Design a protein around this ligand. Sequence first.
Ligand code: AMP
Ligand code: AMP
Ligand code: ZN
Ligand code: ZN
Lengths: 240, 240, 80, 80
Amino acid sequence: AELSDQEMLRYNRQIILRGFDFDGQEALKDSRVLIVGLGGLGCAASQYLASAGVGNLTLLDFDTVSLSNLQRQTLHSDATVGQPKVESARDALTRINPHIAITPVNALLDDAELAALIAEHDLVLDCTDNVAVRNQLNAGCFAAKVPLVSGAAIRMEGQITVFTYQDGEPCYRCLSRLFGEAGVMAPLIGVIGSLQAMEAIKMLAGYGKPASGKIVMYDAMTCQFREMKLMRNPGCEVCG
Amino acid sequence: AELSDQEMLRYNRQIILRGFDFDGQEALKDSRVLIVGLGGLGCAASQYLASAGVGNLTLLDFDTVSLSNLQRQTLHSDATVGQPKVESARDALTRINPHIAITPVNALLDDAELAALIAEHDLVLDCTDNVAVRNQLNAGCFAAKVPLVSGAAIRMEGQITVFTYQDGEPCYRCLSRLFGEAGVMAPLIGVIGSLQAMEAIKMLAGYGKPASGKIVMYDAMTCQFREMKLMRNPGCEVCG
Amino acid sequence: IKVLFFAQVRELVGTDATEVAADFPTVEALRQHMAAQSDRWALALEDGKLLAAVNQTLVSFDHPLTDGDEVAFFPPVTGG
Amino acid sequence: IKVLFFAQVRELVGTDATEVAADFPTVEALRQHMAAQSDRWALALEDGKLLAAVNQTLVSFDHPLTDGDEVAFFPPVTGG
Ligand SMILES: *O=P([O])([O])O[C][C]1O[C](N2[C]=NC3=C2N=[C]N=C3[N])[C]([O])[C]1[O]
Ligand SMILES: *O=P([O])([O])O[C][C]1O[C](N2[C]=NC3=C2N=[C]N=C3[N])[C]([O])[C]1[O]
Ligand SMILES: [Zn+2]
Ligand SMILES: [Zn+2]
């Protein structure tokens, strides 16, 4: 990728980070990231993926904006209540950064469709709210070897993992096999969504070390952060 | 405070959190928070303080929006370049939540002025970028016993501390005495700003335990979080 | 045995930790035990709605324990 | 002595940690030593642009150390 003059100025604060530089910025500009769920996590994460300069974002969600979302999904607004979340998000995102290409997909996709879609991106952010789609995303990501930056939040608890799908690395089912409305505090989504954006950028640009092989757990109630190591399960249905 | 019907719906996901409830929501609605710095941290934090329903926010910054800010200060936009950050932020914030009162102050205040201003709020967020104003804020907060939620970010490193100014608790000078352009990755501000919003809400509503007596340090490069305990310095100029 | 409780588990059972004695074989043995202490306990440590790490590493409800073993119970999270 | 290095300190000196020997009295004695290893080291551990914790607690450059002491060097941060 090449950056225009206006881009270099906009992205100056990233460009001058040591091992990031123009190349890292260019890498973001050339990336295609798929963000699944433009709810709380998605809004929080996409806003910075956008601002940061990730050049192509595909926004995938089947749902519309509701009034209750506005407590935390800050890309959306009262004026966008009733609109497809991907559209309200796209409109907000294009204002955060008009240099990026944003493709909204208002649909609930099947596995065949996710396979195509996942393969077409460099990285997927899982910002959904149910294990079914999370497992679907993990399955497609594993198959195609497309890194998945997985975030979750409910109540006062958040978590993040990066799945890079290397040999010997656990997948998301390695985790989800270990288990089988609720409220959610607004800023929690900000923390975890921003962490997703961060890990995504780091992966896309090969900058620093991804949070793979661990669950980073944020206990907002006590402001503590625990990192539990995640091991591959021999008989994981997906990666076993 | 009393919440309208439309408010209860908007804030439902917080209201149904266990020890939060209507009272906690009402507490936010009745709060007056002063956010100093509507740059990266300020944008990230105010957006969720706003969305979350903190009823009165005073935004204080002397600076205008520049193009370089847009890489991370997502409340601002190309269309607001040249405007006072507090104005661009207020306009964005009012759209995030039109139920809250937002008071922009485009000024660089002196100590006499901060004293009045700090005293008039329940809580201050320090989202500045220089130790001079941070110390000023700490001084005024200590004097008035108004909790200060202090965030900092540069490069790939962020930090947060809550100063509640209780007997025996260290103040910010306890920390700043231990020490005496650079880039900054966009999402870093999101993480720390959202953590500020979180700790602020927690303080305002008496919910959970504040991150006082420690520096929470986030190393984005490695996605690690270290919490170093902060002790009061006997001869701290301010709290000694 | 440092058994630690995090987030909602902690909030439900009212303790961040309980130094217990090393009388437990595993993790699904512990959970059972601790769940039987009260409904609050049962809900908090309810199978399916729980995750367990042994010594900073996440394990299935069959990993085993020993004196000097730290065990952490905390919720999985699939919302977002 | 686990001396750990975080964030920019680590990035500058290229190691997350160096198990060293307990031959240091304090913190400002260590810093000096380690800073003299190279300009990279000096910049990273440059006085004024550094913070130190001894055993998970932040200290001034005069706290003292001992075998079993973990020492962490990392940058303060005032930007935002
Ligand atoms: O956690 P939130 O409810 O704030 O956001 C989750 C977001 O994810 C969407 N989602 C769930 N399942 C999906 C999906 N989007 C696209 N495909 C599938 N299968 C949900 O609508 C939310 O906005
Ligand atoms: O760190 P950023 O540069 O992204 O944001 C800091 C923000 O703080 C403002 N600031 C510095 N000093 C201030 C102040 N605002 C109000 N009063 C004082 N003394 C700066 O302009 C930034 O926008
Ligand atoms: Zn697996
Ligand atoms: Zn002090």
